[PDB]
Structure formats: structure tokens, C-alpha cells
């Protein structure tokens, strides 16, 4: 009855989605081949697969996913991978020409002739669902096609469904480590699109994950493959509460009314714990008190922005496993007592907790070791003001002498758009610093 | 699937092309007979990128090979691997160029260019979505330097949307190859910044000095120099033809490599470069590759890349490897030598990866260079042009076929403009 729809566009997205499905695939007991190994009959009074899967009539399941990109290499890559027989053959909407890191090429000239196809596909899929809870969107903002299709699809989505919520997981460029050079330009235009159409978004800058992988996982030569599963796990914990029994349930609806003080301040950061390999795990405590304490460690924050330079607004942390509920109050009481974590004056309580019962499941062959307590803490705080501050500075300096400007104007975008976009951040940065003043 | 076509003219352009297909043929498993004999099944999923289909199961490469004299082309297909080229794709006149632009552009060049335009259009429209053009020609020679520009101007007008690259061999001051090189060479360079999109020079001077200080072979032949260049192109289109993690098509480089409209000259080089004697004893690891890529001498351009600062650059790392070290090494290099990189454009080094290394190696890198030092050759080319034109030497034949003094002043006029307009960004401070 209650279902969610997945949206993925962008090499950062298409692949991350390529991972987030395996974690779900293994948990619910459906093998990659597409056929459940029976032995799960006897009136089956549990539709545990509805929250992500849909019945095909006898046997297999077709996941609710739409794959989009303007290049064939990636999309068709999954068509002949180990997951060839799972995704719908025609549901992998694939373009024909690369975006070439020109946002204008992705929002006014080429994207139009295929976006109609995308909105068409979302129409048929949604009708089957009866209790659509919302939308999940993973996109790469520091890229050409990523921002373009994401911003364009977001725009058309809001004009057809309305109050339906939408959660966005963006991947902005890291402070000092990044690939694209024109990335500060194309990303800046993105904030204008997603500032007034997406309720909730989580910063997941790349640079932080490397530190988390190296600092704890004790792996010095990671690849993009291992980065994803850490991101994928967050998805596994976030959406679990819908599809598992719990003593204190948490629904997606309790984010658009539980963790955003105002319609404007709607950016928050994430984190994960524990992060232990398969060798060093057993020789630690991993108790309720310990797991929470590592949650607020600054260096472990998934966003390269020390939370210690600001206050906190409201954080919703979801527990899955066998955490004793009275232990939950044990951690929160101590944390408030400490001094290095400070909260704004006007918010007395800023934590809303939940308890699941299904333990986290570890993908075979990975790095994360099997555990029995874990937590996914999310925080929207004034600290994130730095990330906007840093990106803007990289922007205005290079825009001073119209570097790379020609590639954008010559494609149709108005030259005055950059004037407003920077005006967008200016207001947002101004808005943030005002809320932090004590009353 | 974003196919492209190759047009090369002149024997110099012809020579480079001959090696390129063979090297490209091997990577995609094309034998001199042309019957597919690949091992993995990844060698055909993009065979259309550089090859069509035919009845009987033989792949006919899509190339335009043509020159103003028959002797050179009679040899290019004369040796092995030449049978792949389809006879219909060859067009050749019977006059000769004689190291003068005039004959091969207006009198003889015009009288035969019509046929070439017919051949190119047939194939070009054949593809499903044209992805770009890549032309190998010589600016210091007769047929290449002169014919190539005229064809480049003609094609670009008809297809204002696609991209275009260029591989030219500007002549070296130390060693000479023709006395009329300055005249025709300079007059040709002015005709690229207006039509073509991307330019990446190659210097025979770097070819010789590279062979003897890194490779250490006493007798090197023209076979050796061509192989290095053939690899240079082979890495540019690597990502476009194989799977990977962060694909970057031909266009993607342009938006990241060219900051301003009149600043689209690049310099390329190949790494790793190691001799036979040192074949094994070095550790093929990420740190080794990154150091030799930016080395002073490893570059293939006569200019010294330490006499100024870089505007932008990108790397196409090839072959399976970790990602973390790739970013960190790029981050470290941009720091320890900040003075060699322009200040007002942050994060001025690109990254790119592919999942298939070249056959015969475990790690490979192809660097692209847009350096302020590129102006050094232009001073060498331009300065010589001044003195030679002072005494109207060798001029009266240039004026022998309708070619007049109006553009000679104009053509050289832009070259000085390009050089000066190129240097003011070096001292520009935000």
C-alpha cells in the first residue's frame, strides 16, 4: 500500500543507484537472477517487497526505478551486466550524445526532446502504486547532464503532483579535491533550481568519504566502488522504517514537518557509524552509549565542514537493530551536557528518535563487518554555511574575467542569468547568518 | 553511437595516418587481413566507433586518404596493412605541390577539392550522429599545409555544430626541412583559429631528442617517431570507445580545456616513456606516472613548459587503477608548484578514467597541454617571417597565381596579434 519511487540521473547517480539496488536486493531475499527461491510461502502475510518491488504475477519482481542519461556507454553497460534480467528492458531511457559538462546544453537544447519521455515513464509507473509516499532523487550536481536533467525534471515534477514530497541527495564538489574545472560554474546554477522545489537535501561531498574510509576502514587505495556502499547503507537505514516492524515508527512524512524550521533553510548533512572492517570489529564495545558518541565526532562527518563552527538546528537519528530503548535516552542526556556541542537558543528539543528491529545486512565481499547496533544521524545546522561560502568564492573570482563564458551563452542561455544565480546564494547565505543570532 | 571520420592529407599527414589505423587495429583486434580475432567480448561493443560493416564479414575503416601527387600514396598502401583502405576513398591528382601554398589551394587545390567534398559528405552523413573530425596534416609542407586549411574552412561552414581537432607539425628552428617553410607555415596558422576548434601541435624536434635521451636507440628511423604520435591520438579517443567510470567525449575536453575563444592551442605528450634497458626495473605505480607526465623534457612540444604558467590541462588515465591516489596526486602537483599555474582559475587540472589499458602495459596516461609557453614557437616562426619578407625573397612566385600582398600582411598580422593577446593573461591578476 505504501511505496516509494526512485529517480537516478548522472554517472554519479547511475552508478550509485547501481549499488543501492544490490543492498536492497540482498536484504529482502530476492536473488539477482530475478526469481525468489520459493521456500517463503504459507500465506506470506508480509508484503516486505512492496516498499521497493512490485509483483509481476508469478515469480520475478520489477523494481520501481527510472534510469536516465544522455550517453549510451553507462546505461547500456547495465543492460549486459550481472543485472541484465532484472530491470525493465525499456525502462532504461538512454540518450545519444554526451552532455560535455555544459549545463546550458543540458537544460535548453537537448534535454527537451527526451524529458518528455521521462515524464511519460514516471506517469505509467506511478499509476500502479496506490499509496505513493514520495520521491527519492540521486543526482550529481557538479556535472553537465546531472544538474540539467535533475533541475528540469524537478521543475516539471512539481507542476503535476504538487504537495507530494521529494528528497534530494546531491553530491557537490569537494573543498579541495575535485575533477571538473568549470564545475564551480555549472553547479552554481543548480542551487537556483533545487532551492525552491526540493524540501530536503543531504550534502555528501566526496572528500569526506575518503577520510572516513582511510581513517577507520584502514584502506589506503580505495576506488569508487567502495565509496558507494557507504552511501548506499544510508539509504538502507533511512527507508527501513516503512518496511519493518518497530516500537517507535518513523515515516518519510516526518521530515517535511520535523527537521526544517523554514521553507528556505532546507539543507542538512549526514553521517554513519560504526565503520569497522572485518578484522578489528569484535574487539570493541559497540554498545548503545559508544555508538552514539562517535556519531557527533567532527572529522567523521560526511561533509567536509566542521560542525564545530556553528550551532545545530534539529537532528533526526534513526536506530535499527536491537537497541534497548532506555539506552537511547542514556546517550542524549550526556550529549546535551557537554559543552563543545551547542544548540541555538530558540530550539529546546531537536531530536526525534525511532527504533527498528531488523539488523543491518552486509553485502558479501565488502568492507563493513557484521554488527548488531548502528545509527544513521542527520543534521541541518548553520555549519553548512561554509560550503556555500567556499563554492561562491571560487565562482566570483573566475567570473570576474568571463572565463569559459562563451560555451554557455552561445547555446541560448541568457547572460543575465549568472547575475541572479549569485544573487540566489547571496540571499541564502544572508538568511543563514541571521537565524544564528541569540534572542 | 557517436562515430567519427578521419581526414588526413599530404605524405606527412599520410605517414601518421598509416600507423594510427594499425595501432588502432591491434587494440580492437584487427589483423592485416581484417577478420576479427578478438578474445574478450568487450572488443566489439564499440567497433562502430571507427569501423563500418560490409558483406562477407570484413571491416573497412572510414578514412579519407588523398594527396596532390600519386607517389606517396602509392607507397602508403604499398606496404602491409594498406589493403584495408577502400579504393573509392583515395583521390589523387597529377600535378604536385612544390612546397608552395598557392598551387595547392587556388589553382590546383581548387580544381580538385570538389571531389574530396563529395567523398567526405557521403561517409559523414552515413553515421547516425556525427561526433567530430580529426585531421592530421603538416603546416610546413606543400600539399598538407595548404590543402588542409582550405578543406577545413569548407567543411566547417557546412556543419557548424560538430567539433574539430587538429594535429600539425610546426617546423623546428634547430633543424630545417624546407626553406619556404616560414611563408607557407605562418600563412596557414592564421587559418585555423578562425574555423577549427582544437589544435595540438607536435614537434619533430621533441621526437628526436625524446628518442635519444629516454628511449636510447641509436638508429632512430621514421618508424619510431610515428609510433609515439600514433599512441598520442590513441589515448584521446580511448574513453569514447571503452567502458569506464568517468567518460569524457571529444567535446567534454573543449569546455574544460579552452577558456576563451581565441586560446585553443594545445600540446600533447605520452607517458610512461621508458627504454628497453629500463623495461622492467621500474615500478609501474601511480606516483611514477604523475612525476614523468609533467617532466620538463617528456613533453612533445619544442616549447619549454616551465617558462610560464598553465591555463588549463586534463589527463586521460587509462587502465584499471585506484581513484583516491589519482585525485591526491593531482591535488599535490597543483600545490607544490603553484607558481607554474595561473592563479585566477582554481582547480586547473582535469581527471578522466577508462577501464581498458593499452595492450602491452598496465598503466597509461595521455596528457593535454594548454600552456602559456606555447607562444615561444610563434616568436620563432613569426620573427623569421619578418626578415624573410623584408627582402621580398621568394615572394614573386607566391604572387604568381593570384595570391597577392593584401593577405600576406594580414596573415602575418594576426600571428603577432595572437602572440600578444596570448601573453597578457600571464601577467593578469584578479
Amino acid at each position: 500500500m505504501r511505496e516509494v519511487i526512485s529517480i537516478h540521473v548522472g554517472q554519479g547517480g547511475i552508478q550509485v543507484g547501481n549499488a543501492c539496488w544490490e543492498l536492497f536486493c540482498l536484504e529482502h531475499g530476492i536473488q539477482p537472477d530475478g526469481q525468489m527461491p520459493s521456500d517463503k510461502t504459507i500465506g506470506g502475510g508480509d508484503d516486505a517487497f512492496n516498499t521497493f518491488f512490485s509483483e509481476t504475477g508469478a515469480g520475478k519482481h520489477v523494481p520501481r526505478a527510472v534510469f536516465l542519461d544522455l550517453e549510451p556507454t553507462v546505461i547500456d553497460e547495465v543492460r549486459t551486466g550481472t543485472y541484465r534480467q532484472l530491470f525493465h528492458p525499456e525502462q532504461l531511457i538512454s540518450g545519444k550524445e554526451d552532455a560535455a559538462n555544459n549545463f546550458a546544453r543540458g537544460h535548453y537544447t537537448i534535454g527537451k526532446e527526451i524529458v518528455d519521455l521521462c515524464l511519460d515513464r514516471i506517469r505509467k509507473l506511478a499509476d500502479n502504486c496506490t499509496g505513493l509516499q514520495g520521491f527519492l532523487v540521486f543526482n550529481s550536481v557538479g556535472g553537465g547532464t546531472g544538474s540539467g536533467l535533475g533541475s528540469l525534471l524537478l521543475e516539471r515534477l512539481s507542476v503535476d503532483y504538487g504537495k507530494k514530497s521529494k528528497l534530494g541527495f546531491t553530491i557537490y564538489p569537494s573543498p579541495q579535491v575535485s575533477t571538473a574545472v568549470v564545475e564551480p560554474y555549472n553547479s552554481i546554477l543548480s542551487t537556483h533550481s533545487l532551492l525552491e522545489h526540493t524540501d530536503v537535501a543531504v550534502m555528501l561531498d566526496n572528500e569526506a568519504i575518503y577520510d572516513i574510509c582511510r581513517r577507520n576502514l584502514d584502506i589506503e587505495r580505495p576506488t569508487y566502488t567502495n565509496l558507494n556502499r557507504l552511501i548506499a547503507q544510508v539509504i538502507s537505514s533511512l527507508t527501513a522504517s516503512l518496511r519493518f516492524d518497530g516500537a517507535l515508527n518513523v515515516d518519510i512524512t516526518e521530515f517535511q514537518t520535523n527537521l526544517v524550521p523554514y521553507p528556505r533553510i532546507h539543507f542538512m548533512l549526514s553521517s554513519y557509524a560504526p565503520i569497522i572492517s572485518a578484522e578489528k570489529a569484535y574487539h570493541e564495545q559497540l554498545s548503545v552509549a559508544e555508538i552514539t558518541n562517535s556519531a557527533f565526532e567532527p572529522a567523521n562527518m560526511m561533509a567536509k565542514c566542521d560542525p564545530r563552527h556553528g550551532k545545530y538546528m534539529a537532528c533526526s537519528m534513526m536506530y535499527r537493530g536491537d537497541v534497548v530503548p532506555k539506552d537511547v535516552n542514556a546517550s542524549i542526556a550526556t550529549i546535551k551536557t557537554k559543552r563543545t556541542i551547542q544548540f541555538v537558543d530558540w530550539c529546546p528539543t531537536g531530536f526525534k528518535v525511532g527504533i527498528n528491529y531488523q539488523p543491518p545486512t552486509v553485502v558479501p565481499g565488502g568492507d563493513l563487518a557484521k554488527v548488531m547496533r548502528a545509527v544513521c544521524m542527520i543534521s541541518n545546522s548553520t555549519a553548512i554555511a561554509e560550503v556555500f561560502s567556499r563554492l561562491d568564492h571560487k565562482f566570483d573570482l573566475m567570473y570576474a574575467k568571463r572565463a569559459f563564458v562563451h560555451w554557455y551563452v552561445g547555446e541560448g542561455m541568457e547572460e543575465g542569468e549568472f547575475s541572479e544565480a549569485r544573487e540566489d546564494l547571496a540571499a541564502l547565505e544572508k538568511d543563514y547568518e541571521e537565524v544564528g543570532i541569540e534572542t | 553511437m557517436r562515430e567519427i571520420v578521419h581526414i588526413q592529407g599530404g605524405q606527412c599527414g599520410n605517414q601518421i595516418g598509416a600507423k594510427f589505423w594499425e595501432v588502432i587495429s591491434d587494440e580492437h583486434g584487427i589483423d592485416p587481413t581484417g577478420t576479427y580475432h578478438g578474445d574478450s567480448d568487450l572488443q566489439l561493443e564499440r567497433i562502430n566507433v571507427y569501423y563500418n560493416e560490409a558483406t562477407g564479414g570484413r571491416y573497412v575503416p572510414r578514412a579519407i586518404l588523398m594527396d596532390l601527387e600519386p607517389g606517396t600514396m602509392d607507397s602508403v598502401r604499398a606496404g602491409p596493412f594498406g589493403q584495408l583502405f577502400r579504393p573509392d576513398n583515395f583521390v589523387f591528382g597529377q600535378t604536385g605541390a612544390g612546397n608552395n601554398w598557392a598551387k595547392g589551394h587556388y589553382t590546383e587545390g581548387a580544381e580538385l577539392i570538389d571531389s574530396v567534398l563529395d567523398v567526405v559528405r557521403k561517409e559523414a552523413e552515413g553515421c547516425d550522429c556525427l561526433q567530430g573530425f580529426q585531421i592530421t596534416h603538416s603546416l610546413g609542407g606543400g600539399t598538407g599545409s595548404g590543402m588542409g586549411t582550405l578543406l577545413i574552412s569548407k567543411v566547417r561552414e557546412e556543419y557548424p555544430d560538430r567539433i574539430m581537432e587538429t594535429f600539425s607539425v610546426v617546423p623546428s628552428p634547430k633543424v630545417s626541412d624546407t626553406v619556404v617553410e616560414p611563408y607557407n607555415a605562418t600563412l596557414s596558422v592564421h587559418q585555423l583559429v578562425e574555423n577549427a576548434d582544437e589544435c595540438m601541435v607536435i614537434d619533430n624536434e621533441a621526437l628526436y631528442d625524446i628518442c635519444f635521451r629516454t628511449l636510447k636507440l641509436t638508429t632512430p628511423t621514421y618508424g619510431d617517431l610515428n609510433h609515439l604520435v600514433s599512441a598520442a591520438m590513441s589515448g584521446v579517443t580511448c574513453c569514447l570507445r571503452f567502458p569506464g567510470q568517468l567518460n569524457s567525449d571529444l567535446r567534454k575536453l573543449a569546455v574544460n580545456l579552452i577558456p576563451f575563444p581565441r586560446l585553443h592551442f594545445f600540446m600533447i605528450g605520452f607517458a610512461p616513456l621508458t627504454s628497453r634497458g629500463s623495461q622492467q626495473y621500474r615500478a609501474l605505480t601511480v606516483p611514477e606516472l604523475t612525476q614523468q607526465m609533467f617532466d620538463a623534457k617528456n613533453m612533445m612540444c619544442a616549447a619549454d613548459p616551465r617558462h610560464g604558467r598553465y591555463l588549463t590541462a586534463s589527463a586521460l588515465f587509462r587502465g584499471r587503477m585506484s581513484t583516491k591516489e589519482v585525485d591526491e596526486q593531482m591535488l599535490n602537483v597543483q600545490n607544490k608548484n603553484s607558481s607554474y599555474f595561473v592563479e585566477w582559475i582554481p582547480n586547473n587540472i582535469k581527471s578522466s578514467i577508462c577501464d581498458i589499458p593499452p595492450k602491452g602495459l598496465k598503466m597509461a596516461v595521455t596528457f593535454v597541454g594548454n600552456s602559456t609557453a606555447i607562444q615561444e614557437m610563434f616568436k620563432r616562426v613569426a620573427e623569421q617571417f619578418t626578415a624573410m619578407f623584408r627582402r621580398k625573397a621568394f615572394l614573386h612566385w607566391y604572387t604568381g597565381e593570384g595570391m597577392d600582398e593584401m593577405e600576406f600582411t594580414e596573415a602575418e598580422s594576426n600571428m603577432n596579434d595572437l602572440v600578444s593577446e596570448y601573453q597578457q593573461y600571464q601577467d593578469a591578476t584578479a
Binding site: S419, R422, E423, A426, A427, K430 | T409, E410, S413, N416, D417, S420, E421, Q424
Partner: peptide, 29 residues
């Protein structure tokens, strides 16, 4: 025929003056 002067088309430069104005005004407020 030489064109390299860069001491100053003028319409754009004037706009840049206006562009900075708003950001200062937002900064001032």
C-alpha cells in the same frame, strides 16, 4: 590592422558595475 587594446563593448563593462552593486547592497544589509 592590429587589435589588442584592452584598456577599456563598453555596455558589458557598465553592466558589471551594476552587477556588483546588488551584492554590495545585500552585503550592506
Amino acid at each position: 590592422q592590429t587589435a589588442n587594446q584592452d584598456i577599456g563593448p563598453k555596455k558589458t563593462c557598465n553592466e558589471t558595475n551594476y552587477a556588483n552593486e546588488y551584492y554590495n547592497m545585500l552585503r550592506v544589509s
